[PDB]
Design a binder for these strands. Structure first.
Lengths: 88, 95, 130
RNA sequence: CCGUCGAAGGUGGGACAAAUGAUUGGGGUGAAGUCGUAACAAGGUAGCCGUAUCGGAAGGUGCGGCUGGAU
RNA sequence: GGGCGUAAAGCGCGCGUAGGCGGUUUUUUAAGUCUGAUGUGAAAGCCCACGGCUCAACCGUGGAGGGUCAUUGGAAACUGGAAAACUUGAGUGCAGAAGAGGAAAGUGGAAUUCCAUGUGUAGCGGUGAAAUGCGCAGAGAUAUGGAGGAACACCAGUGGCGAAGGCGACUUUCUGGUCUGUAACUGACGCUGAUGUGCGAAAGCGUGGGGAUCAAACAGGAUUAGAUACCCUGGUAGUCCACGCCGUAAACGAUGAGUGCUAAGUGUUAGGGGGUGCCCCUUAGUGCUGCAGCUAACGCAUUAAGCACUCCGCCUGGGGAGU
RNA sequence: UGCAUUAGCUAGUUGGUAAGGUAACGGCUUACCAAGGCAACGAUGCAUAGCCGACCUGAGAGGGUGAUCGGCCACACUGGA
C-alpha cells in the first residue's frame, strides 16, 4: 500500500517517543489506511477472489487490537474515529 | 518490489505543445495510483550510439519509476509497438 | 502452551524408554514439584533444585540399573486441566499399603500419601521454578 | 324500553379421516416350467464410473471416463 | 461404549468469522485447587444394632446417623482473547530461467470434389470369417493445379500450476498471481476453512455458426453344432467460437482432511552458491524414497493413523432402504 | 417431545405512571408507547399426563423412576348465567 516513509507521519504524530511500529493504536491506524490505499486496487481487480478474503483476514487481526482498545480506552477509542473516516 | 527502468525514445519531429501532452500520457500511466519515482529528467539535442529506423533525432525523457502494483510498465510497452510515437524503449526488471 | 504438562509427560516417559539420564522438560510456573512428586520413593529418582530463569527448562535426572533397568513401566496422564480429581472423605485407595509419594496437596504444600487419610484431602501438588 | 355480553344453532371454505371402484407403483412370493454365459480368468467383445438410450428378464453400436492388459 | 484409509468411515466443493475452538516473553488488581458462620445433622432413606409371628403383615432409637447444613474472604509469572519488542522461513515473491497467464491469422501451399487437368481411370473411404461406394439416354481415383478446414506438423517442458485446470504455420498481452537458497519493511502466528460465488470431464448449456475423409441407425454383406450386433462401407444427424449460461466422474485409480521425528535425498522444466561446478544445495510448488510406535492384520514414518497442535467426523437393526 | 419427509414468533412482543379492589404491585384498563423486532432458552405450534414419596438394576461407571398405599389435583348427562 503506502511506502514506509509515505505513511510514517501518522505513526510519529500518534505514537510516543520511540520511532517504531507495533502499537495497538498505531497498527489499527496503519491498517485502516492500508485498506483505503488498496481500495483503488479492489475496483479494477473485482473478477479476482484471492485478495477479497485477504482484507477480511486483515480486519480479523485488527479485531484483536480493537478488542484491547475496548478494554480500558475511552478517549483513545474516539481519537481514531473523529480524526480519520470510520464508523462508531 | 518490482522496479522497472523504461528508456523510451520519442519521434525526432514533434511540437513541444504536443510533446507536453505526449509525456503527460506516458507519466499518467507511470505515476498512476502512486508515482513512487526517484527523479525526472529531460535530455535534448544528443546523438545515439546505435541507429534504429534511420531517423534524424529524438527527444529523451527517461525517468526511474519504482512500482508495487505492477501497472506502470504495462501500457508503455504496448504504446511503443501499436502506435507510431515511441521507437526504442526498455524493459529492465533490476531493482 | 495448551497443556501444562504436555511435553513433561512426553519427556520422562520417552527418556525412560530410550534411557536418558538427563532430561529437558520445559519448566513453567507449576512444572517443578509436579514432575518431581516421586522424589520421596525413587520412581523419578531425585534432583538438586530446579535452576533456570522465568520458566526455561527443568531436568529430571533419571537413573537406571546395570543393564539399563527402568523402574517406571510407562507414565500416563490422569489429573490434567479441565476436570478435577479431588479426593475428599469418600474413599482413599490402597495397594501395597505405603511405598512411594503421590499427588495430594492441601494447605501444607507438598506432602506424602502416608498421612493422606489423616488429612482426608486429595489435591494436585505444584511448585514454582527457581 | 334502547342497549352490553353469553351458550346454542344454520353452517362457510378448507384440511382431516375412512371405506368404494378403477388405477398406478412398491416388497418378496409361485422354488432356472418363459428365455438366456445379462458378468467375473487371457470371459469370441481383455477388465471396469456418470450418461442419450435403457428389456416377458436379460444392454450396447453414441457421451466423456478404465490397465483393472496375458503369453 | 466411534473412525478421521480396506473394516464402522475419503465433504471433487481448492476462496471466506458456526465464537466450537488455533505459541505470542514479561506482565494483572486475587476466574482458582485446600481451611471459613454449623445451629441443622429427619426421613415406605441401606439404621451401626434394634421384634416376634417356624413358611406371613405384626416397629421405638431424629444427638449417634452417614443420606450434615466448615472446603476460603483466599496464594495469579496461566483453555480461544496479549500493549513496549525484533526476527525470515512466508507477503508482492528480494535477485532466476525457460510462461509468449493466451496466436484467433491475410499474401499463404499439400489432398479424397466437380474438374483445368493429375499416384487421371481400379485409385482410394475399405472387413475376428463378414467391405459397401463412383450414368444406363449419359458416370471418382490428386505428384499437382484454380481451394483448405474447427485454418496450422515443430518452440506445447514429470514448466512456473496461484483450485480439481501446462497455450503457436515464429509472433505481440504482463492478469490477480504461486515457489526452493535470500529478509531490504511494520510486526506478530487455526480448522482443505459459515460468507464452500453452489466453481465442477461429461450428453444437456448463451452451441454464433454445424454436419465435411465422413458416420450411429441404414444397404448391407458372414460362419457353425450357435452373432440385424461389433468390423468396414455411399449414408442424415453426431463433434465444434464471443453472447445470463452450462455442475457426475477413473473431480478420489473405488485413494480430502494441521504432526513431526531413531537411513538419504528432495529430482521436474533448466535456472542458481560456499566461490570454483571437488567439501556445500535445509527443502518447496513435485515424484516421493522405511526403520523406532500404532493398527486384529492390510497398511500410514525427513510429509505415521505412536504421542504433545483444529472444528469436523461414521458405522445404528443386514436390513425396510435409496423406497 | 421432537419436526429435515415444517426450521422461526411475539407488536403495549419490550419497559412508563396515574379511573378500582380483591390474598397484593398492578401492561387490567387507565395517557401513550418502536425497527423487522423479539426470541434458540424452538418463546411461539404440538406432546398430551393426574404429580410425588417408590421397585428392579452395570459388579460398580452407566440406567431405570410407579403397582402400590397416602397427600394433594380433578371430575360429577351436556354446557351457560
Amino acid at each position: 500500500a503506502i511506502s514506509q516513509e509515505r505513511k510514517n507521519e501518522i505513526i510519529k504524530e500518534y505514537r510516543v517517543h520511540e520511532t517504531d511500529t507495533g502499537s495497538p493504536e498505531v497498527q489499527i491506524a496503519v491498517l485502516t489506511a492500508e485498506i483505503n490505499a488498496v481500495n483503488e486496487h479492489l475496483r479494477t481487480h473485482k473478477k479476482d477472489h484471492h485478495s477479497r478474503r485477504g482484507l477480511l483476514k486483515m480486519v480479523g487481526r485488527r479485531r484483536h487490537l480493537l478488542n484491547y482498545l475496548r478494554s480500558k480506552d475511552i478517549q483513545r477509542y474516539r481519537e481514531l474515529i473523529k480524526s480519520l473516516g470510520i464508523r462508531r | 518490489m518490482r522496479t522497472y527502468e523504461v528508456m523510451y525514445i520519442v519521434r525526432p519531429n514533434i511540437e513541444e505543445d504536443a510533446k507536453k501532452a505526449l509525456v503527460e500520457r506516458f507519466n499518467g500511466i507511470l505515476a498512476t495510483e502512486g508515482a513512487e519515482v526517484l527523479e525526472a529528467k529531460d535530455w535534448g539535442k544528443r546523438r545515439l550510439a546505435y541507429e534504429i529506423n534511420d531517423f534524424k533525432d529524438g527527444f529523451y525523457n527517461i525517468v526511474r519509476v519504482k512500482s508495487d502494483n505492477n501497472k506502470a510498465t504495462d501500457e508503455f510497452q504496448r504504446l511503443a509497438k501499436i502506435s507510431d510515437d515511441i521507437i526504442r524503449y526498455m524493459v529492465i526488471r533490476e531493482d | 502452551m495448551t497443556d501444562p504438562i504436555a511435553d513433561m509427560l512426553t519427556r520422562v516417559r520417552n527418556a525412560n524408554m530410550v534411557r536418558h539420564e538427563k532430561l529437558e522438560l520445559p519448566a513453567s510456573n507449576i512444572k517443578k514439584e509436579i514432575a518431581e512428586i516421586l522424589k520421596s520413593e525413587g520412581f523419578i529418582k531425585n534432583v538438586e533444585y530446579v535452576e533456570d530463569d522465568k520458566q526455561g527448562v527443568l531436568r529430571l535426572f533419571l537413573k537406571y540399573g546395570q543393564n539399563d533397568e527402568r523402574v517406571i513401566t510407562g507414565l500416563k496422564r490422569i489429573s490434567k486441566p479441565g476436570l478435577r480429581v479431588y479426593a475428599k472423605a469418600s474413599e482413599m485407595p490402597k495397594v501395597l499399603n505405603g511405598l512411594g509419594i503421590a499427588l495430594v496437596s492441601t494447605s501444607e504444600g507438598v506432602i506424602t500419601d502416608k498421612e493422606a487419610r489423616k488429612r482426608n484431602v486429595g489435591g494436585e501438588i505444584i511448585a514454582y521454578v527457581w
